[PDB]
Amino acid sequence: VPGDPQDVKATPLNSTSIHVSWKPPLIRGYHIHAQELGKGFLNEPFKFDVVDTLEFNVTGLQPDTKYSIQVAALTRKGDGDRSAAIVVKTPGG
Ligand SMILES: [Zn+2]
Ligand SMILES: [Zn+2]
């Protein structure tokens, strides 16, 4: 099974979306996982399926909101290792 995607970058495009790009693990499908950020409670994260591309615009997000972005390759047992999280805030505030 593959390791984590390499050289991940993420930057907001507008108040509702983020352009995520990466290089393959050291694979035709990936997941992008986006989690909105005193007891460690979290709302439901977003997941995006990506096929046959090494970048993707994740959309439908909340304005003025911090998101943790991770990418994973898809494998026979589920996701491979996730890239180290990138925290980015959408504009709109
Ligand atoms: Zn996944
Ligand atoms: Zn999937």
Numbering used by the authors: 708 to 733, 741 to 751, 755 to 810
Please, what does the article write about this entry?
Surprisingly, we uncovered a tripeptide, Lys-Gly-Asp (KGD), in the Dlar FN5 domain that is similar to the RGD motif in FN10 and is conserved in the Lar-RPTP homologs across species.
To determine if Dlar possesses the structural characteristics of an integrin ligand, we sought to find a crystallizable region of the Dlar extracellular region encompassing the FN5 domain. We used the anomalous signal from bound Zn2+ ions to calculate experimental phases and obtain an initial model. The final structure was refined to a resolution of 1.3 Å. Overall, the Dlar FN5 adopts a prototypical β-sandwich fold described for FN domains with two Zn2+ ions. The first Zn2+ is bound by His-745 in strand C and Asp-766 at a crystal contact and may be an artifact of crystallization. The second is coordinated by residues within a single FN5 domain, including the Asp-796 from the KGD motif and two histidine residues, His-745 and His-747. Although the KGD of Dlar lies in the same general area, the side chains are not as accessible for binding with the Asp-796 positioned against the β-strand and the Lys-794 pointing back toward the molecule instead of accessible in the solvent.
